[PDB]
Amino acid sequence: DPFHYDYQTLRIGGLVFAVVLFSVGILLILS
């Protein structure tokens, strides 16, 4: 059905992509 999109799943997946990038930055300057 092309009338509903799986929001609240992109939110969880997107925020994971944000944490992964944010954590790598900290794990780069402290090194």
Partner: protein, 960 residues
């Protein structure tokens, strides 16, 4: 208030001895009582007033007042406008404080990098204690060129002048004397006021007041950037009101027009450009200070990259000032000094009276009394604290003499006279060791020519035979032979006064020289070497390829000066002076053409008779200039004359008679381990080591600022076009608004303002010291080649990258690009809830705005994506990324954090109500990749062509 009374009643007033001073233990009893010897600094802010002095203070209080009104209006029922005003002040305020609380923590660290010393006498011994650790009782010995540590009462003056220059403000130096002259302490002679410099002479006094209870206790870049900010702010305000009135003409409820006004003003001005410039200078000043290179002002950091001439001196700067004797000439015999603990070789006899006669003069005038307990250490390595020449003479002699302390104690002095760099005499009287000949001794620090003009009979195998007409020729021959090895010869004369004319109880004077010394006896000359420092030839080679004309101003013979200059590299291999050309072809120098000679060696006395035009033509005609046996007044002469042709001169000095030279020059360089306090405080630069390899590395560091500061300006100005173009096509082309205001606040105050600091940590390129110095007048930080690159080439590519994301989302949701033109009138109409797209569907008002606000979010992400390549290509402006590398971890940190922020604002729940930011599908994160790859490819080719043919059209109009 102790000049009226005598010394004995004030010496006992503090339990002090006139000679022994205080004990090493009694100081701590009163140091812990009186406290440190320092003034009272002004009270410090608790660090929270300064934070609130930038957020709420200043001209930004109106935004805080405006922000509150919007929030209350939304509360009683607009919310967008409150967050914009709140975010502008908080982000700008918290950024202007982070870059101010960081520089302050650095600029305050230089007050303790080099301390203040004072010579104090305690328990019959002198030491260099910190100036703050001075009790109100001890005995301090002040010297010419130093500053007094506290209020003094002179008990033994030796002809010294003290320049007050602080109370009355007059630069005339008042002479000081131990005898009382006036009742008023302000015009007496016993009392020396605190915080003043003793120019000449020496004196010794008892401290009477310390700390609070004392007499005294009772940049061009920042201008050009600031001017440019005002110029671009005027355009922003002019464009803002132009589009504020125009929007109201179309009708936008007066709140959607204020949100438009903020989005135009912010998108056109660099919101933190002035903060980066200030911190970047302070970052290098700290970086320049890790290397042995200290700066007093922040303007000296701005300078020192535009330096065009360095007028250094030979002794101490280019040489260690640790000399060793290597050759001698006496009795018409050549000699070679060999030094070993066993005295091998036997190159000279050790029984003639000449050796002891020439040793009795230098061994007694050494003020350096050897430390007890160093006898186990070999006498060769026993450190001597005194004149380097007499120290080397002692080390030559001390290898022979057995008991040195007994030798020093055997004979005494009567009076000492201060030395001068121009007078070059230090007369003293020593008793003759011979008991029958009750005569005295003379000491003189003179050149061999001067002593030859002063002596008429030479000593050879015992008796003073008269000179010969061939002896002078042999003398000059040996003089040139020894001076060709880069060694300085010494002439020291000792004579015995007539017994009948000099009685056994005479008390002569020192100021008036009534001493018979002409036509005396002499033996021979001794030569010593002063090797250059390890990294001086490399620095001189670097200056040659960097367009720095280094000038050496020494104080010895022209032959030795030329030899040493050739040794270090001032006179490069392939150049010769007019005398060298004349000697090559055996022609008189007067007929030698002076245009084929690019080097000149100028006599100090010959310099006095030159006019300004002569000095100017000498400077303009030669490229490798050295100055031989010149005085610091003549050093001022060069410094004034060298910058008459638009040169940034950096002269170095340590003596008290160098202040006019250090003040006239664009950069004044002092010495941290051998410089006097007067020079250390009249200069704009202190060398923590006297290497002269730290001036060149200091020039490189000052040169690196202008590169990294240029890079951090191009990056922050590039993101201006993508933030102002959307509003241009929103009205001109009548399309739905492709960029919101908080979305602008993220591009401008976010991924552009903050990541620009990361470019200040870049390393020097491969040609940092291989290009001519920049002219501080015709070279500007922001120029037409930098505006043409940020606003015309890379800014346009970024703008198209954001616009592509704007059309992809609208096309994928129904609104194809064909029928987007002219739809703005109905798109923004709140009453049109049946707008038709290209597929025939009908949209309500709040259904289009969700799609529009999704285009705003993708525009932000696309600008961030194309700023990955913008920050990479801003790392270098001449080199390439593949030949520079990703070394600094702050730029990579910025890339990985600005992306996380972008992926958080769009995907965090609740941000669609406050910031009007909606989630975007994974397919929409790659819309700016083709344009991001274009920025990296285009700039790499541009920097590849620019390297192949220097000076071409590409470098003329794109090398920013």
């Amino acid at each position: 208030t102790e000049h009226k009374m005598s010394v004995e009643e004030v010496c006992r007033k503090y339990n002090t001895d006139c000679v022994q001073g205080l004990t090493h233990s009694k100081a701590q009893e009163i140091l812990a009582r009186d406290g440190p010897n320092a003034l009272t600094p002004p009270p410090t802010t608790p660090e929270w007033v300064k934070f609130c002095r930038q957020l709420f203070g200043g001209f930004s209080i109106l935004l805080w007042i405006g922000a509150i009104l919007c929030f209350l209006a939304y509360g009683i029922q607009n919310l967008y406008l409150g967050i914009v005003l709140a975010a502008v002040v908080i982000i700008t305020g918290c950024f202007s404080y982070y870059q101010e609380a960081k520089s302050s923590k650095i600029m305050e660290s230089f007050k303790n990098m080099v301390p203040q010393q004072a010579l104090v006498i305690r328990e019959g011994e002198k030491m260099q204690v910190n100036a703050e650790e001075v009790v109100v009782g001890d005995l301090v010995e002040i010297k010419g060129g130093d500053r007094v540590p506290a209020d003094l009462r002179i008990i033994s003056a030796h002809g010294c002048k003290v320049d007050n220059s602080s109370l009355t403000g007059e630069s005339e130096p008042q002479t000081r004397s131990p005898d009382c002259t006036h009742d008023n302490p302000l015009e007496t002679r016993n009392i020396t006021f605190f915080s003043t410099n003793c120019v000449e002479g020496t004196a010794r006094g008892v401290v009477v007041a310390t700390g609070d209870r004392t007499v005294m206790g009772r940049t061009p870049i920042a201008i050009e950037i600031e001017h440019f900010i005002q110029l671009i702010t005027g355009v922003a305000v002019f464009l803002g009101v132009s589009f504020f009135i125009l929007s109201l003409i179309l009708g936008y409820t007066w709140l959607e027009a204020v949100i438009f006004l903020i989005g135009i003003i912010v998108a056109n001005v660099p919101e933190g450009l002035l903060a980066t410039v200030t911190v970047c200078l302070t970052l290098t000043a700290k970086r320049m200070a890790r290397k042995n290179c200290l700066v007093k002002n922040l303007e000296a950091v701005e300078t020192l990259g535009s330096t065009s001439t360095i007028c250094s001196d030979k002794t101490g700067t280019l040489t260690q000032n640790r000399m060793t004797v290597a050759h001698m000439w006496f009795d018409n015999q050549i000699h070679e000094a060999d030094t070993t603990e066993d005295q091998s070789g036997t190159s000279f006899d050790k029984s003639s009276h000449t050796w002891v006669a020439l040793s009795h003069i230098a061994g007694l005038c050494n003020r350096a009394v050897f430390k007890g307990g160093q006898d186990n250490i070999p006498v060769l390595k026993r450190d001597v604290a005194g004149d380097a020449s007499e120290s080397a003479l002692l080390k030559c002699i001390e290898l022979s003499s057995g008991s040195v302390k007994l030798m020093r104690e055997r004979n005494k002095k009567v009076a000492e006279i201060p030395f001068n760099s121009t007078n070059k005499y230090q007369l003293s009287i020593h008793e003759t060791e011979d008991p029958n000949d009750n005569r005295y001794l003379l000491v003189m620090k003179g050149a061999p020519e001067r002593i030859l003009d002063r002596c008429s009979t030479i000593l050879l195998q015992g008796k003073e035979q008269p000179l010969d007409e061939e002896m002078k020729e042999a003398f000059q021959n040996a003089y040139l032979e020894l001076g060709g090895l880069g060694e300085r010869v010494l002439g020291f004369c000792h004579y015995y006064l007539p017994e009948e004319q000099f009685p056994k109880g005479f008390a002569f004077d020192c100021d008036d020289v009534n001493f018979t010394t002409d036509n005396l006896c002499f033996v021979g000359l001794m030569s010593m070497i002063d090797p250059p420092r390890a990294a001086v030839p490399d620095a001189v080679g670097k200056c040659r390829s960097a367009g720095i004309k280094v000038i050496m101003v020494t104080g010895d013979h022209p032959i030795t000066a030329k030899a040493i200059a050739k040794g270090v590299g001032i006179i490069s291999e392939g150049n010769e002076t007019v005398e060298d050309i004349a000697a090559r072809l055996n022609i008189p120098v007067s007929q030698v053409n002076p245009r084929d000679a690019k080097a000149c060696v100028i006599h100090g006395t010959d310099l006095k008779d030159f006019t300004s035009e002569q000095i100017d033509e000498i400077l303009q005609n030669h490229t490798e200039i050295v100055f031989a046996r010149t005085s610091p007044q003549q050093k001022l002469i060069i410094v004034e004359g060298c910058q008459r042709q638009g040169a940034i001169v950096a002269v170095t000095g340590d003596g008290v008679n160098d202040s006019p030279a250090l003040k006239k020059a664009d950069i004044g360089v002092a010495m941290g381990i051998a410089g006097s306090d007067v020079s250390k405080q009249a200069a704009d630069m202190i060398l923590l080591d006297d290497n002269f390899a730290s001036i060149v590395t200091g020039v490189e560091e000052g040169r690196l600022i202008f590169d990294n500061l240029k890079k951090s300006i191009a990056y922050t100005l590039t993101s201006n076009i993508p933030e102002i173009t959307p509003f241009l096509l929103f009205i001109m082309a009548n399309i739905p608004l492709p960029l919101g205001t908080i979305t602008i606040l993220c591009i401008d105050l976010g991924t552009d303002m903050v990541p620009a600091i990361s470019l200040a940590y870049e390393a020097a390129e491969s040609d940092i010291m291989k290009r001519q110095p920049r002219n501080p007048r015709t070279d500007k930080l922001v120029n037409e080649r930098l505006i043409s690159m940020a606003y015309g080439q890379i800014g346009m590519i970024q703008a198209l990258g954001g616009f592509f994301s704007y059309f992809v989302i609208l096309a994928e949701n129904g609104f194809l690009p064909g029928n987007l033109v002219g739809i703005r009138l109905n798109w923004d109409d709140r009453t049109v809830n049946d707008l038709e797209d290209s597929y025939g569907q009908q949209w309500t008002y709040e259904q289009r705005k969700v799609v529009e606000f999704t285009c705003h979010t993708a525009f932000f992400v696309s600008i961030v994506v194309v700023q990955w390549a913008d920050l990479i290509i801003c790392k270098t402006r001449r080199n390439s990324v593949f030949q520079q590398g990703m070394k600094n971890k702050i730029l990579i940190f910025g890339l990985f954090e600005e992306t996380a922020l972008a992926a958080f604002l769009s995907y965090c729940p609740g941000m669609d109500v406050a910031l009007r930011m909606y989630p975007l599908k994974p397919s929409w994160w790659f819309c700016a990749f083709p344009y991001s790859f274009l920025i990296f490819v285009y700039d790499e080719i541009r920097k590849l062509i620019l390297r192949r043919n220097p000076g071409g059209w590409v470098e003329k109009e794109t090398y920013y």
